[PDB]
Design a binder for this molecule. Structure first.
Ligand SMILES: C[C@H](CCC(=O)NCCC[N+](C)(C)C[C@H](O)CS(=O)(=O)O)[C@H]1CC[C@H]2[C@@H]3[C@H](O)C[C@@H]4C[C@H](O)CC[C@]4(C)[C@H]3C[C@H](O)[C@]12C
Ligand SMILES: [Mg+2]
Lengths: 476, 90
DNA sequence: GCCTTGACCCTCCCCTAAGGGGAGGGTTTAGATTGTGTGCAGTCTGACGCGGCG
RNA sequence: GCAG
DNA sequence: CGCCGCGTCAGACTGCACACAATCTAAACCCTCCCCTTAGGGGAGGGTCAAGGC
């Protein structure tokens, strides 16, 4: 189509963004219903893992003795007072204790779905719900890379048929009777394989703890993890359908922030991040349109990024808000008084001390480019008028070397002991100076004798016999 | 009751409640873990009332910790009585 | 002169009780709003190279 | 803006 | 394969003087950490002062 005719990233963004038609009032409701359907689907899948609801039950047991409050674990109930939640946790507890004692296998496979759809009633907070899902995630991910290294324990031995190797591995999972038929195959590969049949043992039996740790076996929670992925990827592509359809809301908001130190695309990217938060935190059951909430989050993200990354030397958000308040107060006083308000009267229009306002006024200036043309000459820039102030003048370098030579003369006009006491007492010809105790430990002498030595040496160097070379280094 | 609402209930500043938590004198009932927000209950106002009642008698903070945690401690209040009598004379 | 030696003495860092004050960081904001606009610059000519394009 |  | 459009690449050298840029928006909560308040105390680290003996 129009592809290839522009390189501007903002034209490309707008062109690619406009291919998504907006949502109606009932479109947002459908998409939010799909999102919550995905998250309750992953809820009802993880309810198949019973240690999850035991964790939530012992969390309520923590709420029993005020380890937490109720608002931290449950945000509501669909089918907020502590009145209902007591019988709610009784409902989940009664289902758990009736599901515990049953071991069978079609007899014990409806009780789990009863558990899941009694647990569906809980509108969990993101904290606990995230905790359970990433917990079961890391559990089967470690045992799953364990299964994957059981497979690639054959690749170190040989290259092997996996399509013949998948028919064996599943379902026994407590023994090597699936591995016993591998030598009934006896193609060359399955020679090498069996010699590592010992170092697979500690792998192939250790998931046998989880075979009784969750109460389930690995193929059941395998399908549970698969339906977990289906549910969360269902919610993820539904949040994406609500983010992509409100990308013009971001632009309508972000055009109001344009020249405040950020490029247009920086603003709409930060607004996009805020919009993704707004989608994550939207409740359609409040009966409000998506624009009313999403505007709050988009405004937050955009103004926060302007506060953070629009200035070269960054000032905090508290000082950003103080500067904004000062500028608004000042443009009101300028309109009233008909002139610029002096910081003294600006200190009574605001209610801050006057030197605080003076330093706030000193803060706000932005650094000048060192390439600004001076007088718009464009052959003379600001940066070539800036001198290096850290250098020392070569007259001062010549003076320092002359002073070193003079000090060497004067200190050679002393005895070795006094010259050593002075060369250690100050840092002369050394990398460090020393205390009286360190110089005394160098001479196995207590500190006051070193002090006396150094005093008499300073007395000698003060004389008119040795000090006319040195006194010339003190400017009169 | 968040710390602002509670600080206005008991009519003392926020930093005072921060301090009373820091020294372990008056601990919030429930601290939200990630934010760190302090939330109090009525049975924290019940203890702050006792704290303020003792603090209007000049009891030093450690003396209040002892007065609230150690019972039958009338020798410390009598000691404080003798010290207050000395400061009234002075 | 060479040393010691106990007695002083200085500066500096941290501490006191019960919070005050501020800096600098987090967080949520629920009527509903859904495509950037400068009243921009555009105004330099000539040589050269390369690539769509008939 | 200017000087050669 | 020859041609037209488009992009890129240049365009004197020293000096003074002058002088930048100028519009452009949140608030109410909470948290931690740091430094401050009296009237000096306590102590490490490091000099200093008369005395005495070698
Ligand atoms: C170091 C330099 C001497 C050459 C002096 C002489 C003229 C001075 C500039 C002008 O005053 C304009 C402007 C004033 C702002 O206040 C600060 C920035 C500006 C650019 C100054 C910078 C600097 O101070 C200049 C270059
Ligand atoms: Mg000029």
């Amino acid at each position: 189509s129009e592809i290839g005719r522009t390189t501007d990233p903002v034209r490309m963004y707008m062109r690619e963004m406009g291919t998504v038609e907006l949502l109606t009032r009932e479109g947002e409701i459908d998409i939010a219903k799909r999102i919550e359907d995905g998250i309750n689907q992953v809820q009802c899948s993880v309810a198949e893992y019973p240690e999850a609801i035991t964790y939530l039950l012992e969390q309520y047991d923590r709420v029993e003795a005020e380890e937490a409050r109720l608002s931290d674990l449950i945000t509501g109930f669909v089918d907020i007072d502590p009145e209902l939640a007591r019988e709610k946790f009784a409902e989940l507890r009664a289902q758990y204790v009736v599901t515990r004692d049953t071991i069978k296998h079609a007899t014990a496979q409806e009780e789990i779905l009863k558990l899941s759809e009694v647990f569906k009633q809980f509108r969990l907070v993101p904290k606990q719900f995230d905790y359970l899902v990433n917990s079961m995630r890391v559990m089967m991910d470690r045992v799953r890379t364990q299964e994957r290294l059981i497979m690639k324990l054959c690749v170190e031995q040989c290259k092997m048929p996996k399509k013949n190797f998948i028919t064996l591995f599943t379902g026994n999972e407590t023994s090597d009777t699936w591995f016993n038929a591998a030598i009934a195959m006896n193609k060359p590969w399955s020679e090498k394989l069996h010699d590592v049949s010992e170092e697979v043992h500690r792998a192939l039996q250790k998931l046998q703890q989880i075979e009784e740790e969750t109460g389930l076996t690995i193929e059941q929670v395998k399908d549970i993890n698969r339906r977990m992925s289906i549910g969360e990827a269902k919610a993820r592509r539904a949040k994406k359908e609500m983010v992509e359809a409100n990308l013009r809301l971001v632009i309508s908001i972000a055009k109001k922030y344009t020249n405040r130190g950020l490029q247009f695309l920086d603003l709409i990217q930060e607004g996009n991040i805020g919009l993704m938060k707004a989608v994550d935190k939207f409740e359609y059951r409040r009966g409000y349109k998506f624009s009313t909430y999403a505007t709050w989050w988009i405004r937050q993200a955009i103004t926060r990024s302007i506060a953070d990354q629009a200035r070269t030397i960054r000032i905090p958000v508290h000082m950003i808000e103080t500067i904004n308040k000062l500028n608004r107060i000042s443009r009101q006083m300028l309109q009233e008084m008909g002139r610029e308000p002096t910081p003294e009267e600006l200190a009574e229009r605001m209610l801050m001390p006057e030197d605080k306002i003076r330093k706030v006024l000193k803060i706000a200036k932005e650094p000048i480019s060192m390439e600004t043309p001076i007088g718009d000459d464009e052959d003379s820039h600001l940066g070539d008028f800036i001198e290096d102030t850290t250098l020392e003048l070569p007259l001062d370098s010549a003076t320092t070397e002359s002073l070193r030579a003079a000090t060497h003369d004067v200190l050679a006009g002393l005895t070795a002991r006094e010259a050593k006491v002075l060369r250690m007492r100050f840092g002369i010809d050394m990398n460090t100076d020393y205390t009286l105790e360190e110089v005394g430990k160098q001479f196995d002498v207590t500190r006051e004798r070193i002090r006396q030595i150094e005093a008499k040496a300073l007395r000698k160097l003060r004389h008119p016999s040795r000090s006319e070379v040195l006194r010339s280094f003190l400017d009169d | 009751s968040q710390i602002g609402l509670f600080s206005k209930i008991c009519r003392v500043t926020i930093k005072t409640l921060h301090y009373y938590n820091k020294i372990g004198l008056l601990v919030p009932a429930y601290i939200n873990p990630d934010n760190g927000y302090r939330f109090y209950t009525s049975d924290q106002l019940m203890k702050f009332h006792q704290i303020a009642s003792l603090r209007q008698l000049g009891f030093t903070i450690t003396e209040i910790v002892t007065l609230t945690q150690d019972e039958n401690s009338c020798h410390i209040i009598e000691r404080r009585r003798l010290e207050i009598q000395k400061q009234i004379r002075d």
